[PDB]
Design an enzyme around this catalytic site. Structure first.
Site, short mmCIF file in Angstrom:
data_model
loop_
_atom_site.label_atom_id
_atom_site.label_comp_id
_atom_site.label_asym_id
_atom_site.label_seq_id
_atom_site.Cartn_x
_atom_site.Cartn_y
_atom_site.Cartn_z
CG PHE A 195 23.42 -17.49 -4.40
CD1 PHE A 195 24.64 -17.43 -3.72
CD2 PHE A 195 23.44 -17.44 -5.79
CE1 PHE A 195 25.87 -17.37 -4.42
CE2 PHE A 195 24.64 -17.38 -6.52
CZ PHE A 195 25.87 -17.33 -5.82
CG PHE B 271 25.91 -11.94 0.09
CD1 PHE B 271 26.58 -12.63 1.06
CD2 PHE B 271 24.72 -11.28 0.44
CE1 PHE B 271 26.10 -12.67 2.38
CE2 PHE B 271 24.27 -11.26 1.73
CZ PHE B 271 24.96 -11.96 2.72
CU1 CUA Z 1 21.01 -9.73 -2.19
CU2 CUA Z 1 20.96 -7.37 -1.20
#
Ligand code: CUA
Ligand code: HAS
Ligand code: HEM
Ligand SMILES: CCCCCCCC/C=C/CCCCCCCC(=O)OC[C@H](O)CO
Ligand SMILES: CCCCCCCC/C=C\CCCCCCCC(=O)OC[C@H](O)CO
Ligand SMILES: CCCCCCCC/C=C\CCCCCCCC(=O)OC[C@H](O)CO
Ligand SMILES: CCCCCCCC/C=C\CCCCCCCC(=O)OC[C@H](O)CO
Ligand SMILES: CCCCCCCC/C=C\CCCCCCCC(=O)OC[C@H](O)CO
Ligand SMILES: CCCCCCCC/C=C\CCCCCCCC(=O)OC[C@H](O)CO
Ligand SMILES: CCCCCCCC/C=C\CCCCCCCC(=O)OC[C@H](O)CO
Ligand SMILES: CCCCCCCC/C=C\CCCCCCCC(=O)OC[C@H](O)CO
Ligand SMILES: CCCCCCCC/C=C\CCCCCCCC(=O)OC[C@H](O)CO
Ligand SMILES: CCCCCCCC/C=C\CCCCCCCC(=O)OC[C@H](O)CO
Ligand SMILES: CCCCCCCC/C=C\CCCCCCCC(=O)OC[C@H](O)CO
Ligand SMILES: CCCCCCCC/C=C\CCCCCCCC(=O)OC[C@H](O)CO
Ligand SMILES: CCCCCCCC/C=C\CCCCCCCC(=O)OC[C@H](O)CO
Ligand SMILES: CCCCCCCC/C=C\CCCCCCCC(=O)OC[C@H](O)CO
Ligand SMILES: CCCCCCCC/C=C\CCCCCCCC(=O)OC[C@H](O)CO
Ligand SMILES: [Cu+2]
Lengths: 31, 546, 166
Positions: free
Chosen positions: C84, C86
């Site tokens: 996802f 980050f």
């Molecule tokens: Cu997650 Cu690039």
């Protein structure tokens, strides 16, 4: 015989093969 | 000769796209060498918000805009000049304007940070509707080009019943028909999905379907980039080298294979996607290896023709023919150097195609390493060389000795930067450095890459100089005052062909049939998978993450 | 001379075309081999497995990252990974060495890569879809997950970890 044209396709063959067998090794080493 | 002016407009707009697109490359090379020069770039170009916006521009301007404008210039004008017939001018100018207009429309959200997707614009990453709309219009410009050349070919055939299609026109017909099939994936993805979705009309898009439709076009588009350069390499370069094309049939066979094999292959961009059956990945993989064939073929045809030229010019031994070639002519140098780098280029592509070996290199810096050899070097260099013969032909403007020498410097520097960058990127990629990454902003993340990172810094500085010299060069030739009408009136340096067994050429000239076959292959290779995916759509909401 | 240059060039070309074909075919054989071995575990599952990216963090196996590792055979573990913006959950992923691991990865937002540094695991992760790939870790220790699909500005620093226990 077109000797130059042969050398060129030699270099190209070698290059393909070093690239392909190279990456095939890496594949099995990471497998 | 009003087709000269329209051709000129395509070439120049293409070259403007390449220059602006290229401004961002030294910055990106520095980045893949662990060096952050983005603060400088944002001083000079304050509208640029991120490394990723730079990367979208670069991708779009270099690999989409420039390449297309080039293809449209070359594969309309050359067939026209071989047939000695005028293109439908109202159509020609129409295509230029669609191209210019779609370019201006997509540019607005791009410049305003509303479309920082990449050149792949993968859903659910959701750009501004004007990006999709303008890109659509930009690419449809090519359907007009297809028409233009189909017309010319039928007008010719009519006037010359019972003759085979001349070489360059044969190349252009099969090329444009290829591109028409090929382009349907993206037009589908755009019309059924991206556009509605960006307009607010549907909530979400199914990312797998979007990718599958995309890569239907996304592969054969690179043959659409290549083939204009090949047409030059085949039908022009043997003259400039001082010899002749060794075989018209072998040149037709290569192009015919591109028609058949360029489109049914796209799963080779999806070896790592879920939801696509492995047996289909293997079929595409095999079909991808086959598409390497017209280039293996090209390697030999073209190599024999250069050797031939070199033998004509006095060279002897195993390398004498190389030495004997016109290395003082940038229009000969640029494609030849491109061809040399195409050897590792195509070797890397053959690796990418093997289904399982792609897991080694997929989404790493390896891939940019492969493709800068193919497009940023062979296609671009071949376009750069056409400056030195195409331009004078189109404008009457002369190439001075000074400009010829500068052109040699640009073309060698550009080549050398791309080789050096290619080593840095393949090697970094083998060390697992990801592509599409502002990695210099995580300087401690890729320590095992310190060595190939030196190659990228170097490459970046060499390609900056190459590019600055190109801009000064290109503008010298465009802006000069003189016009000698003996350059304008001169013939295009079309090669003569050593001669051809007619059997083969006639068969290859049954274009309607080969076209139908190519279309069947695409149905067989994409039908089954697209029917399952369209039966099971899982549309998902979009996201702006920039 | 041209007469002699012509058929000689073509004769050798014919040889070259046959050799290069043979090389292509050899690669095909060698690929097919990889396809029959444990190393092909990393090829994604071809089967569509659809999920709702909007409720995937609220209910179902990605909802609770600390139970994501499920023993599914005597020497096999299934791991539900969320990739996802980050990051990756769980963090770390913890697995025994020598066990076959079936990674079932998805995304709640945009596409991400899932590249396990030092292995062949390298799979696109699509919201709405579960990507399924298989691997056995032969060596214990720490393996970094790399995101290799541009996912937005958080991209270059999206990393994960897998720990393989002795
Ligand atoms: Cu997650 Cu690039
Ligand atoms: C113009 C642009 C391109 C060409 C041409 C091209 C050719 C190939 N590629 Fe590719 N590549 C694909 C594999 C291939 C294969 C099998 C070929 C083949 O067509 C190559 C055949 C070529 C040869 C076998 C070389 C012949 C050599 C010649 C002809 C030189 C002769 C030299 C002479 C004659 C000189 C003599 C003169 C003297 C003086 C000596 C795959 C996978 O299967 C991927 C996806 C990988 C991944 O994981 O994402 C990849 C991805 C890309 C991407 C990234 C897309 C993205 O952004 O995600 C781009 C832009 C691209 C462009 C280009 N590609 N490629
Ligand atoms: C001055 C010359 C150039 C330099 C130094 C350069 C450098 C680079 C680098 C380092 C990358 C990888 C960036 C990343 O992955 O994050 C890149 C990406 C790319 N380049 Fe170039 N480039 C140049 C010219 C070209 C040209 C001429 C083309 C095509 C004609 C081209 C096409 C592309 C494409 C399509 C990408 C991928 C963009 C994406 O993944 O979205 N480049 N370039
Ligand atoms: C025609 C032009 C072709 C282009 C050829 C140009 C070659 C590049 C110069 C090399 C000299 C060596 C200079 C290296 C000295 C500076 C290195 C440096 O300190 O970099 C920043 C630092 O590492 C951050 O911490
Ligand atoms: C003019 C262009 C014509 C084309 C010709 C250029 C093509 C490059 C070919 C091979 C490069 C490979 C270099 C050597 C291979 C390295 C293998 C290796 O060292 O493996 C790592 C090992 O683990 C130790 O650290
Ligand atoms: C001229 C510009 C173009 C530049 C050309 C690009 C350079 C890439 C070269 C060769 C790829 C060969 C793959 C390298 C194989 C070495 C790794 C190896 O041998 O693997 C065994 C080891 O046990 C594993 O961990
Ligand atoms: C915005 C859209 C304007 C479109 C502008 C298109 C103008 C076309 C001009 C053109 O090239 O055609 C010749 C014309 O008849 C005159 O000389
Ligand atoms: C003719 C030229 C342009 C057509 C104009 C099309 C106008 C499209 C407006 C719809 C829109 O902008 O929707 C944004 C919304 O946020 C959804 O994501
Ligand atoms: C230029 C091309 C621009 C494309 C715009 C419209 C083409 C047709 C789109 C028609 C939109 C249909 C919307 C619809 O019925 O969607 C179902 C909905 O998601 C369930 O609730
Ligand atoms: C002339 C056109 C050639 C077309 C024919 C090409 C041959 C493909 C055949 C079988 C693929 C078997 C692949 C099965 C791989 C599954 C691997 C796996 O188990 O991973 C989950
Ligand atoms: C790390 C990689 C960076 C290094 C890049 C190396 C790649 C190969 C470079 C050049 C090959 C060109 C071979 C052909 C050169 C021909 C020039 C010649 O033979 O000279 C005749 C003379 O100039 C009368 O006109
Ligand atoms: C040891 C490795 C060091 C890294 C290399 C640094 C990069 C470029 C140097 C400048 C290159 C300029 C070469 C131009 C060749 C040229 O223009 O020659 C035309 C010739 O007459 C036939 O075409
Ligand atoms: C063709 C042009 C020549 C290219 C590159 C020079 C190679 C220099 C590479 C040497 C390594 C430099 C380095 O970064 O150091 C290694 C490491 O960090 C130790 O602590
Ligand atoms: C005619 C002029 C041609 C000369 C051109 C030189 C050719 C090859 C040599 C050096 C490239 C050096 C450029 C690299 C610049 C600095 C690299 C760097 O950033 O190094 C960091 C270090 O490894 C960790 O801190
Ligand atoms: C109409 C679309 C054209 C697609 C088919 C092109 C082949 C074809 O039309 O073959 C007959 C030709 O017109 C005889 O000169
Ligand atoms: C271990 C793997 C081997 C790698 C080693 C590199 C292989 C050489 C590559 C290509 C040569 C292709 C040319 C084949 C020559 C064909 C002979 C021929 O066509 O001869 C007709 C002529 O009239 C004569 O008398
Ligand atoms: C004129 C000559 C005619 C003879 C034509 C023969 C072609 C030879 C090439 C390849 C054979 C493929 C061998 C396949 C065996 C693969 C084994 C392997 O690569 O091992 C990997 C790993 O260690 C295990 O998990
Ligand atoms: C001219 C181009 C030259 C190209 C230069 C070739 C360099 C490639 C090196 C290695 C690839 C092999 C991959 C092997 C990866 C295994 C490392 C590993 O296992 O480390 C992680 C693990 O977590 C520990 O516990
Ligand atoms: Cu492709």
């Amino acid at each position: 015989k077109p000797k130059g044209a042969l050398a060129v396709i030699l270099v190209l063959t070698l290059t393909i093969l070093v690239f392909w067998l190279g990456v095939y090794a890496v594949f099995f080493a990471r497998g | 000769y009003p087709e000269k002016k329209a051709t000129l407009y395509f070439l120049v707009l293409g070259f403007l796209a390449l220059i602006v697109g290229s401004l961002f490359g030294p910055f990106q090379a520095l980045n893949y060498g662990n060096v952050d020069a983005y603060p400088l770039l944002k001083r000079l170009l304050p509208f640029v918000q991120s490394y990723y916006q730079g990367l979208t521009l670069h991708g779009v301007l270099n690999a989409i805009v420039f390449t297309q404008l080039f293809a449209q210039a070359i594969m309309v004008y050359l067939p026209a000049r071989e047939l000695n017939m005028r293109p439908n001018m109202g159509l020609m100018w129409l295509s230029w304007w669609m191209a210019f207009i779609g370019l201006v429309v997509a540019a607005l959200p791009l410049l305003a940070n509303e479309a920082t997707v990449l050149y792949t614009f993968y859903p659910p990453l959701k750009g501004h509707w004007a990006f999709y709309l303008g890109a659509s219009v930009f690419v449809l410009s090519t359907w007009v080009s297809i028409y233009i050349v189909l017309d010319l070919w039928r007008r010719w055939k009519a006037a010359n019943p019972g003759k085979v299609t001349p070489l360059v026109t044969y190349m252009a017909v099969v090329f444009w028909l290829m591109w028409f099939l090929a382009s349907l994936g993206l037009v589908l993805e755009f019309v059924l999905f991206l556009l509605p979705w960006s307009f607010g009309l549907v909530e979400g898009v199914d990312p797998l379907v979007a990718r599958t439709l995309f890569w239907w076009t996304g592969h054969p588009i690179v043959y659409f980039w290549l083939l204009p350069a090949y047409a030059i390499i085949y039908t022009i370069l043997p003259k400039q080298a001082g010899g002749k094309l060794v075989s018209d049939p072998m040149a037709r066979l290569a192009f015919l294979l591109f028609l058949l094999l360029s489109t049914p292959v796209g799963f080779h961009h999806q070896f790592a996607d879920p939801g696509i059956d492995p047996t289909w990945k293997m079929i595409h993989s095999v079909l991808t290896l086959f598409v390497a064939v017209p280039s293996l073929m090209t390697a030999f045809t073209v190599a024999a023709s250069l050797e031939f030229a070199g033998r004509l010019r006095g060279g002897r031994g195993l390398f004498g023919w190389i030495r004997a070639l016109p290395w003082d002519n940038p229009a000969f140098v640029a494609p030849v150097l491109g061809l040399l780098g195409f050897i590792p280029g195509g070797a890397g592509g053959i690796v990418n195609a093997s289904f399982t070996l792609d897991y080694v290199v997929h989404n790493t810096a390896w891939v940019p390493g492969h493709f800068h050899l193919q497009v940023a070097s062979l296609v671009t260099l071949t376009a750069m060389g056409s400056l030195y013969w195409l331009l004078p032909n189109l404008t009457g403007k002369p190439i001075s000795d000074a400009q010829r020498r500068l052109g040699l410097a640009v073309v060698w520097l550009w080549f050398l930067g791309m080789m050096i960058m290619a080593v840095g990127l393949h090697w970094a990629g083998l060390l697992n450095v990801p592509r599409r990454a502002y990695i210099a902003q995580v300087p401690d993340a890729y320590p095992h890459a310190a060595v190939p990172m030196v190659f990228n810094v170097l490459a970046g500085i060499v390609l900056l100089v190459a590019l600055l010299l190109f801009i000064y060069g290109l503008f010298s030739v465009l802006l000069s005052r003189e016009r000698k009408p003996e350059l304008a009136e001169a013939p295009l340096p079309f090669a003569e062909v050593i001669s051809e067994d007619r059997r083969l050429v006639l068969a290859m000239d049954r274009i309607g049939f080969w076209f139908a076959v190519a279309a069947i292959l695409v149905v067989l290779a994409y039908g089954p998978t697209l029917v399952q995916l369209f039966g099971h759509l899982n549309p998902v909401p979009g996201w702006r993450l920039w | 001379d041209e007469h002699k240059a012509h058929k000689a060039i073509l004769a050798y070309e014919k040889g070259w075309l046959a050799f290069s074909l043979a090389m292509l075919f050899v690669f095909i054989a060698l690929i097919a081999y990889t396809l029959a071995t444990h190393t092909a575990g990393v090829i994604p599952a071809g089967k569509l497995e659809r999920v709702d990216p909007t409720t995937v963090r609220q209910e179902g196996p990605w909802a609770d990252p600390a139970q994501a590792v499920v023993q599914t055979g005597p020497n096999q573990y299934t791991v539900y990974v969320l990739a996802f913006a980050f990051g990756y959950q769980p963090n770390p992923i913890e697995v025994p060495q020598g066990a076959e691991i079936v990674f079932k990865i998805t995304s709640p937002d945009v596409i991400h890569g899932f590249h396990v540094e030092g292995t062949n695991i390298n799979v696109e992760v699509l919201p709405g879809e579960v990507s399924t790939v298989r691997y056995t870790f032969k060596r214990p220790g720490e393996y970094r997950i790399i995101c290799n699909q541009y996912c937005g500005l958080g991209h270059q620093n999206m990393f994960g970890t897998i720990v393989v226990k002795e």
